[PDB]
Amino acid sequence: GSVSKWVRLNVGGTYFLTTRQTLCRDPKSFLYRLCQADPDLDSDKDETGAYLIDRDPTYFGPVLNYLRHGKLVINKDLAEEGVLEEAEFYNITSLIKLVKDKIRERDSKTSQVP
Amino acid sequence: GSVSKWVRLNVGGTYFLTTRQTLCRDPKSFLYRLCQADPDLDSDKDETGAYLIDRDPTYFGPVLNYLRHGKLVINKDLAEEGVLEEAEFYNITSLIKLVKDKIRERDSKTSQVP
Amino acid sequence: GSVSKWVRLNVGGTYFLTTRQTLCRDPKSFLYRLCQADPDLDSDKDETGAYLIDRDPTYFGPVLNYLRHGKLVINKDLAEEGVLEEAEFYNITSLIKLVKDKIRERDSKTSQVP
Amino acid sequence: GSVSKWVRLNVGGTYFLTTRQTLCRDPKSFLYRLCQADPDLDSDKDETGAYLIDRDPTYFGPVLNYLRHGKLVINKDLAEEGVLEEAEFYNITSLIKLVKDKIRERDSKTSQVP
Amino acid sequence: GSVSKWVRLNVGGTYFLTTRQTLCRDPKSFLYRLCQADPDLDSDKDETGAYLIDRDPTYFGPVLNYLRHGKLVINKDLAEEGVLEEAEFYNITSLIKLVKDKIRERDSKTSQVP
Amino acid sequence: TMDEKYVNSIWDLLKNAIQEIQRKNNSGLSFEELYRNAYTMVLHKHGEKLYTGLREVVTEHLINKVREDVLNS
Numbered sequence: 229g230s231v232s233k234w235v236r237l238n239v240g241g242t243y244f245l246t247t248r249q250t251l252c253r254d255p256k257s258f259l260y261r262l263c264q265a266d267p268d269l270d271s272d273k274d275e276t277g278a279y280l281i282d283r284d285p286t287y288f289g290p291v292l293n294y295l296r297h298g299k300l301v302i303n304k305d306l307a308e309e310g311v312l313e314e315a316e317f318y319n320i321t322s323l324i325k326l327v328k329d330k331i332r333e334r335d336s337k338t339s340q341v342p
Numbered sequence: 343g344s345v346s347k348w349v350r351l352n353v354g355g356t357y358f359l360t361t362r363q364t365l366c367r368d369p370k371s372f373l374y375r376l377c378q379a380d381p382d383l384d385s386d387k388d389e390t391g392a393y394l395i396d397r398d399p400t401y402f403g404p405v406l407n408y409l410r411h412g413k414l415v416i417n418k419d420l421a422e423e424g425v426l427e428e429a430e431f432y433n434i435t436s437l438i439k440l441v442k443d444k445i446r447e448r449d450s451k452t453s454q455v456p
Numbered sequence: 457g458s459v460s461k462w463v464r465l466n467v468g469g470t471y472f473l474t475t476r477q478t479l480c481r482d483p484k485s486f487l488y489r490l491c492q493a494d495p496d497l498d499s500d501k502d503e504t505g506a507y508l509i510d511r512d513p514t515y516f517g518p519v520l521n522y523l524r525h526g527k528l529v530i531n532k533d534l535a536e537e538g539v540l541e542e543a544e545f546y547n548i549t550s551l552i553k554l555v556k557d558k559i560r561e562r563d564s565k566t567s568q569v570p
Numbered sequence: 571g572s573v574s575k576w577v578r579l580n581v582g583g584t585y586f587l588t589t590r591q592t593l594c595r596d597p598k599s600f601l602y603r604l605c606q607a608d609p610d611l612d613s614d615k616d617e618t619g620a621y622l623i624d625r626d627p628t629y630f631g632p633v634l635n636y637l638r639h640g641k642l643v644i645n646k647d648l649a650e651e652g653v654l655e656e657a658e659f660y661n662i663t664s665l666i667k668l669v670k671d672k673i674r675e676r677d678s679k680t681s682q683v684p
Numbered sequence: 685g686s687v688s689k690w691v692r693l694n695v696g697g698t699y700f701l702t703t704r705q706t707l708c709r710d711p712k713s714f715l716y717r718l719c720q721a722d723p724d725l726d727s728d729k730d731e732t733g734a735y736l737i738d739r740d741p742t743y744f745g746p747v748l749n750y751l752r753h754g755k756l757v758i759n760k761d762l763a764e765e766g767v768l769e770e771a772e773f774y775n776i777t778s779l780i781k782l783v784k785d786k787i788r789e790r791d792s793k794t795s796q797v798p
Numbered sequence: 799t800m801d802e803k804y805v806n807s808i809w810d811l812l813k814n815a816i817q818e819i820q821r822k823n824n825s826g827l828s829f830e831e832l833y834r835n836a837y838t839m840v841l842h843k844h845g846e847k848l849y850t851g852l853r854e855v856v857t858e859h860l861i862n863k864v865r866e867d868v869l870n871s
Contacts, residue, residue, distance in 0.1 A: 612826075
């Protein structure tokens with residue numbers, strides 16, 4: 229087909245399959261720029277046509293989840309700072325707007341003396 | 343019979359295999375609609391025949407297993423707050439309930455006052 | 457070929473190759489029935505003959521490993537209860553006892569505070 | 571063809587995909603050496619085209635994280651010295667430098683008194 | 685070819701890959717004997733060519749990495765004894781030595797009196 | 799005790815390579831292998847020998863081969 233609503237991301241080794249609409253939640257996002265059909269982008273595995281994005285696949289889950297259901301879901305092992313910087317790369321200004329608070333919330337709660 | 347009893351959910355790029363009657367625990371569920379042969383499903387299909395679904399492939403585990411053995415299977419690392427919003431999408435109303443309590447259950451020990 | 461001492465299960469999509477004697481460790485187990493060459497079996501993926509077993513592959517590990525060396529080997533990321541349910545389906549009695557002790561040890565320690 | 575912009579690592583069995591520039595922050599580093607297209611050392615290519623690096627597959631995360639975003643990204647449960655003993659190997663001193671401070675920073679609390 | 689410089693492990697279903705010489709930091713060890721290509725005691729292999737090693741892979745981190753770089757590789761929540769117990773199986777005498785100090789060292793604080 | 803012959807074992811493998819690199823048929827070597835062996839030796843602090851061993855192996859080649867040919871030229 230000339231277009232396919234499903235975009236295939238090769239995010240640093242771990243494949244992610246998601247809908248164009250999910251990536252296009254806020255067009256400023258670097259992910260949105262990938263979705264466009266304009267002729268600038270050409271980086272993909274030739275056989276499968278998956279965009280080659282060279283970033284940590286592990287931390288990409290929270291980034292994509294926010295772009296799928298608008299919340300910060302982070303597995304307990306994944307570092308909050310890791311998604312933060314990971315989020316910074318894709319330029320989803322809202323996500324970074326959130327992560328620092330949880331970061332601050334995480335630290336403030338911990339170091340808080342009674 | 344020109345029909346099968348086993349379906350291939352291509353959730354989040356991952357292939358989950360499961361049998362029709364497994365998904366029909368809650369007929370008001372998103373999947374139960376996927377489980378049928380209705381006049382509004384043929385488009386969402388892969389070259390293999392697997393149904394192309396565009397949500398998280400990892401938080402789907404607790405959802406699908408609950409439809410298998412009616413109990414929550416949260417891999418310890420996963421976050422309770424994360425499946426809830428995967429549960430909501432699939433419309434397993436009862437499952438939505440017990441996770442919410444689990445979220446509330448966790449705060450009993452985590453939001454406690456010594 | 458006369459017969460294949462190797463048999464190729466399908467457990468929720470993930471192929472688990474194994475040998476009969478591995479599957480015949482417990483007289484009353486689900487997996488034991490599969491080994492029978494009697495005419496009551498129709499889940500062969502005839503493209504290769506792999507029998508289909510619609511349940512979670514991730515917890516199939518400890519079941520198959522115990523079915524070869526009789527100790528509950530675990531990958532920590534897997535859920536404690538999930539293996540209880542998983543084996544329960546396959547009807548490996550001796551194992552489901554062990555896990556029920558494993559959970560008992562896990563919570564009992566978890567249930568104490570000096 | 572003879573050259574490409576993506577280098578595929580097989581560190582410890584797990585696989586990584588990353589860009590040449592990603593492996594050039596420190597050009598004294600082991601990773602940089604593989605990144606070069608020199609025919610002088612054949613290296614340890616794998617049939618998948620990956621470069622068989624035979625150190626820890628898991629503690630390589632923070633090392634490659636810094637090689638993309640220049641900061642200490644450690645999964646909470648990962649071991650700080652774990653990356654250090656990994657960082658020493660690839661010969662990227664800057665991460666090795668800041669890692670030591672993280673350990674020393676850790677002990678300012680973990681070695682504290684009341 | 686006639687031989688590969690690296691041999692893959694399949695400990696407890698999980699996979700570990702390394703060069704032959706990595707399994708030889710203490711020739712009087714379980715991994716060493718199998719590491720040799722002697723047919724007289726040759727064990728069996730997985731069809732991936734890896735050696736089946738029926739034992740806990742969770743605590744294999746500390747062990748195999750010490751074989752690589754000769755330090756105690758700990759994870760945040762891996763039990764002190766487990767490395768002791770695991771190492772005892774592999775018979776790398778020095779490792780089992782240094783752990784005993786670590787546990788005693790631990791009890792130096794964990795068994796400390798105010 | 800950390801003492802063992804394996805120290806010699808890596809010595810050779812590192813040594814047969816170095817000789818090969820000097821012999822200009824590098825195609826038969828592997829960087830990943832070589833770096834690791836050199837790495838492990840120093841990690842348990844036998845570098846001062848490996849550095850010394852390094853000094854000899856190169857010294858061997860130049861005097862025994864390179865010096866000869868330049869004399870022949």
